[PDB]
Design a protein around this ligand. Structure first.
Ligand SMILES: [Zn+2]
Lengths: 140, 138, 70, 54, 98, 141, 119, 189
RNA sequence: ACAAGUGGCGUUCAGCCACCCGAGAUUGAGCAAUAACAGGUCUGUGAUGCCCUUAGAUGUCCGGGGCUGCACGCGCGCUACACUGACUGGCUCAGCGUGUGCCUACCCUACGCCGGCAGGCGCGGGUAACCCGUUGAACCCCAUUCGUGAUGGGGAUCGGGGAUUGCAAUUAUUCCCCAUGAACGAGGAAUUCCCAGUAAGUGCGGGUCAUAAGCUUGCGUUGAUUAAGUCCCUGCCCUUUGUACA
């Protein structure tokens, strides 16, 4: 309960500054593609007790979090959790994390802008996309 | 042997009181086992007020239904007090009933006398009985 | 608010040598004068009851009450 | 006209599948208990059915 | 074991015909268990008053009550035809099953 | 004295029956007890990973109090309040998968049988297994 | 181009039953509940237009009134007027358009480009 | 021997004013076990005064709309706040509530006149029941606004508020506003 | 249950106030006069008067489209701006009512099996105080964690997938899984609503409905502060008064 000598005040893992003063499954939420419902089963399958702060863990279990986190399908995070369950281009089952969800997002946006389907034209013009009224709401 | 109710609201409690070696059981659980415990003294108010010697011949079994939780508590204590007073008027002499009714009424009148207040109906033009909608002018 | 996530080196003599001389010991008591989080307050002030220098006066899910044992 | 496209649209499950049983309108109906009248034809014949204001 | 079942929208004609039927069955002294008062179903339809929706939005509340009773008796099942010939008053209708 | 479930405090008794349903090792634990949400309204998995034994403990207590119940009434007992975002909140029912697997897993250790009316009830053996645990919380004060 | 891991070079040999496993739930729901005579006779005239071209030329323009049709993978190459209520807009179907609706390629309204407020 | 919360004697506490002697109902008839009575008390003029003072105290903590209708939450809050009085000060808490309400009702006040929006106010004095319920309103403000945004929870803040009106420190929003709205009646004279 | 009994006030008359005995000492809604407005409705009408169109129809059908569009206002509402809280487990309680249909396909659902959900599949019950249903409702209660951070509040916008309805869901109908974390930290001049089971908090039925509620209509549950009065404000009625206004 006293700070260890192995206590970390920051982590910078996957190039986002994870603060060492917060709890672990709420420290990892800055990576886009893990939220909390992914996080608590990540620390369920990585076999770590949840109670510790971000600095209290050693580097070996932390790298077990990241290495099991990148391919969760090896370690029985099951198939309905997945972020892209059928890709347009690959067709593999994947859970896409911080910098790859962004690239797949703007490629799907620009693919919609290329082929003259509706939703990317609604995305480009400045409208709500999913059928909303913008007569009264959403004014900037 | 009496069974005499007490009600506050659509919550209805009736105690089954017959002769014995002392008992209080509200639907099979005793009086120290009811869920709200910030209101624990309300059910115990005849036990603290009358004393356990005044209950010393009876077996009281309380069966409740309906209402909320707090209205159910306020029907439990009223049904218990009416149970002991109905037993005391039928089987004990009436000056003991007079003593128990001035010790019970003067503390709180909901122990012996019911609550005539019920929920008044919604009418149109507003979300409750009295409240009305916001009525823009311009 | 910039609070401690775990105890520093000279926080333990403050936790052990100021706090049983306080009149009222709650989890809202130590964190104003210590700049700590309330999780340290709940866990550490629960652990002192096994050191036997406080007495539990009340327990609730929102408010816990301890004091000096005379 | 042709009797394979004229009134070929399904008149199950619609607002045009139901109408007032008196006045041939479809709007503001009262569907409960097999009345199937619109609200105005309820209010004309209301005491004649037995629905009484109390 | 024949149970006669009465239904109406008004209480007074139903009370007269149930009293008359139990008087005709208590004058011949069959075993009759008394009238069992089943709960009343209120058909309520709350419509708006205005035909074009312009005014101060006053609402209209209609209702109709259905009063549902029965008498049950143990007898020969062709003695039972002679009691239901006095019960032909309007309103109340009679359904008989065994 | 004679100690049944109805005479004792119900905050400790379900956790002591959960301690017995952990410590026997004859309650089966299926493969997906550690990744699931427990209805469509809750946000997260349980804090304590011992939720399956606690849920089975309370389920057998509910079969102690009122039998003649099934899965579809076990979801009526175990519903809750759905926060819906910017819409009003709602009451939304509990999961039939957890109740089906808990009640078959409680049938697996010969503690629970079905009712004559198609739903569920206790055995005499499952009656015994709960009154003994009520007898063992009865001395711990 | 490869769609769900399957290019068009191994997609044109599949039946609708093999399409049922890698499409979305909307189109799988549609081929579950099944198609009607209008789209199938449209498919008849689309096949008949696509046979009759010299192999660098397009098919002839077969227009239609159906905005709700699936892109089935055989239709890649076609020039189809899909009726938006005034106009039959010309689609050039490529294999990356498979799985979208036929009314996505006939746009129904104008870009809203405003002036002054009124009184 | 009616004891409040099971533990509080009502036999000994000292109302040191004459004007609130029939308007703080704490003595022997109004000794009740709980701050809940579910009463019919505000149905007539002047039956709300001989509601018990503890029952008015827990009902006036129900005030804002997140916490409307919830009584047992404030029964729990007043229970832990009375235990906070007995641990921090160690005197009978019913003297702390009596001293807070007797000391903090403002004895002079101001009225608006001036024909509805030109401000010239006039000083008059306050009726004692208005002093009692104004004191409970100025004691329930403060503490909720001083535990609105803080790390301090409400029970220590409310019990310290009743302490801070019982001894008269001028951090007390009951005592601070008491002095302010009596001194403006001093000023408009 | 009547201002009936008592005390007081009261031109000793209308009544008003207080208090016992009492379930109860202003429960709430329907109903609604003389007579008028150029109030709304010819879009409820096989109620209609006339004018209009009446076969390259303004009848009538089938098909795509529309009422949903957005440099922008105004109003009804919902959800919140958190520690009385949030999240996770346990515990225990209602009540108004709905339920297989001339026209016509459209229903309440027990229980068992398979899934993490919407659901899939089958035997049953019900035209109702019988079956769903002891309607195991939410808030409230009891312990865990969180610790004042735009944070674990806010869940707006935005991606892939699965199911249901239907002839058909694109301009996502609905639902669930995962991801994303916008102002917002309690709102200024003006103003809306309200007096006891009342405001408010909180859910459940009815309507519309092949799918169904941020609306409306009811039901209950937890349940208060404050007033027991005035004509200052806003409307309105009345009496006296002025007219060349009808
Ligand atoms: Zn009608």
């Amino acid at each position: 309960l006293v700070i260890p000598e192995k206590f970390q005040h920051i982590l910078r893992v996957l190039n986002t500054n994870i603060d060492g003063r917060r709890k672990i499954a709420f420290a990892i939420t800055a990576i886009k593609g893990v939220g909390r419902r992914y996080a608590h089963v990540v620390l369920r399958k990585a076999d770590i007790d949840l109670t510790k702060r971000a600095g209290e863990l050693t580097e070996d279990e932390v790298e077990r979090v990241i290495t099991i986190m990148q391919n969760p399908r090896q370690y029985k995070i099951p198939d309905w959790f997945l972020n892209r369950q059928k890709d347009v281009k690959d067709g593999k089952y994947s859970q896409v994390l911080a910098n790859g969800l962004d690239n797949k997002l703007r490629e799907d946006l620009e693919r919609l802008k290329k082929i003259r389907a509706h939703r990317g034209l609604r995305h480009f013009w400045g409208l709500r996309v999913r059928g909303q009224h913008t007569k009264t709401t959403g004014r900037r | 042997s009496v069974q005499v109710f007490g009600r506050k609201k659509t919550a209805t409690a009736v105690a089954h009181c017959k002769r014995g070696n002392g008992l209080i059981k509200v639907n099979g659980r005793p009086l120290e086992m009811i869920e709200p415990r910030t209101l624990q003294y309300k059910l115990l108010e005849p036990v603290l007020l009358l004393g356990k010697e005044r209950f010393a011949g009876v077996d009281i079994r309380v069966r409740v239904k309906g209402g909320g939780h707090v209205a159910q508590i306020y029907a439990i204590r009223q049904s218990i007090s009416k149970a002991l007073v109905a037993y005391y008027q039928k089987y004990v002499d009436e000056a003991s009933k007079k003593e128990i009714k001035d010790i019970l009424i003067q503390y709180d009148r909901t122990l012996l006398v019911a609550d005539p207040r019920r929920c008044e109906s919604k009418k149109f033009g507003g979300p409750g009985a009295r409240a009305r909608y916001q009525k823009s002018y311009r | 608010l910039n609070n401690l996530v775990l105890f520093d080196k000279a926080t333990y003599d403050k936790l052990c040598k100021e706090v049983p001389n306080y009149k009222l010991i709650t989890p809202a008591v130590v964190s104003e004068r210590l700049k700590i989080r309330g999780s340290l307050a709940r866990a550490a002030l629960q652990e002192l009851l096994s050191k036997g220098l406080i007495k539990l006066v009340s327990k609730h899910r929102a408010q816990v009450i301890y004091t000096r044992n005379t | 006209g042709h009797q394979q496209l004229y009134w070929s649209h399904p008149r199950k499950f619609g607002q045009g599948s139901r109408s007032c049983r008196v006045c041939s309108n479809r709007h503001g109906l009262i569907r409960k208990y097999g009345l199937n009248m619109c609200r105005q034809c309820f209010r004309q014949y209301a005491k004649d059915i037995g629905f009484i204001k109390l | 074991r024949i149970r006669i079942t009465l239904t109406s929208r008004n209480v007074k004609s139903l009370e007269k015909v149930c009293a008359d039927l139990i008087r005709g069955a208590k004058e011949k002294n069959l075993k009759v268990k008394g009238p069992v008062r089943m709960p009343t179903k209120t058909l309520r339809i709350t419509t708006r008053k205005t035909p074009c929706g312009e005014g101060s939005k006053t609402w209209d509340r209609f209702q109709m009550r259905i009063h549902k009773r029965l008498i049950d008796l143990h007898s020969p099942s062709e003695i039972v035809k002679q009691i239901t010939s006095i019960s032909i008053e309007p309103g109340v209708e009679v359904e008989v099953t065994i | 004295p004679g100690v049944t479930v109805k005479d004792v405090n119900q905050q400790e008794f379900v956790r002591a029956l959960a301690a017995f349903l952990k410590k026997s090792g004859k309650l089966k634990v299926p493969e997906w007890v550690d990744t699931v949400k427990l209805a469509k309204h809750k946000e997260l998995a349980p804090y304590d990973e011992n939720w399956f034994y606690t849920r089975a403990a309370s389920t057998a207590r509910h079969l102690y109090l009122r039998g003649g119940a099934g899965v579809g009434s076990m979801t009526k007992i175990y519903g809750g309040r759905q926060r819906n975002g910017v819409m009003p909140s709602h009451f939304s029912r509990g999961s039939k998968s957890v109740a089906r697997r808990v009640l078959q897993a409680l049938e697996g250790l010969k503690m629970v049988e079905k009712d004559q009316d198609g739903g569920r009830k206790l055995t005499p053996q499952g009656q015994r297994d709960l009154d003994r645990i009520a007898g063992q919380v009865a001395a711990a004060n | 181009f490869t769609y769900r891991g399957v290019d068009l070079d191994q997609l044109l040999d599949m039946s609708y039953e093999q399409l049922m496993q890698l499409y979305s739930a909307r189109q799988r729901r549609r081929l579950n509940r099944g198609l009607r005579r209008k789209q199938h006779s449209l498919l008849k005239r689309l096949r008949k237009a696509k046979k009759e071209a010299p192999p660098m030329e397009k098919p002839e323009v077969v227009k239609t009134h159906l905005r709700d049709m699936i892109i089935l993978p055989e239709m890649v190459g076609s020039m189809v007027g899909v009726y938006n209520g005034k106009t039959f807009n010309q689609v050039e179907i490529k294999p990356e358009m498979i799985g979208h609706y036929l009314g996505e390629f006939s746009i129904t309204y104008k870009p809203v480009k405003h002036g002054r407020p009124g009184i | 021997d009616i004891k409040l919360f099971g533990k509080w004697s009502t036999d000994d506490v000292q109302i040191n004013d004459i004007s609130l002697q029939d308007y703080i109902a704490v003595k022997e008839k109004y000794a009740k076990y709980l701050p809940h009575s579910a009463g019919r008390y505000a149905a007539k003029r002047f039956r709300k005064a001989q509601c018990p003072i503890v029952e008015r105290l827990t009902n006036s903590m129900m005030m804002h709309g997140r916490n409307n209708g919830k009584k047992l939450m404030t029964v729990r809050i007043v229970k832990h706040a009375f235990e906070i009085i007995h641990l921090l000060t160690g005197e009978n808490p019913l003297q702390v509530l009596v001293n807070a309400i007797i000391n903090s009702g403002p004895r002079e006040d101001s009225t608006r006149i001036g024909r509805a929006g030109t401000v010239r106010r006039q000083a008059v004095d306050v009726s004692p029941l208005r002093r009692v319920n104004q004191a409970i309103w100025l004691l329930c403000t403060g503490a909720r606004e001083a535990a609105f945004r803080n790390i301090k929870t409400i029970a220590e803040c409310l019990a310290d508020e009743l302490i801070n009106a019982a001894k008269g420190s001028s951090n007390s929003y009951a005592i601070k506003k008491k002095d302010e709205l009596e001194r403006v009646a001093k000023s408009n004279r």
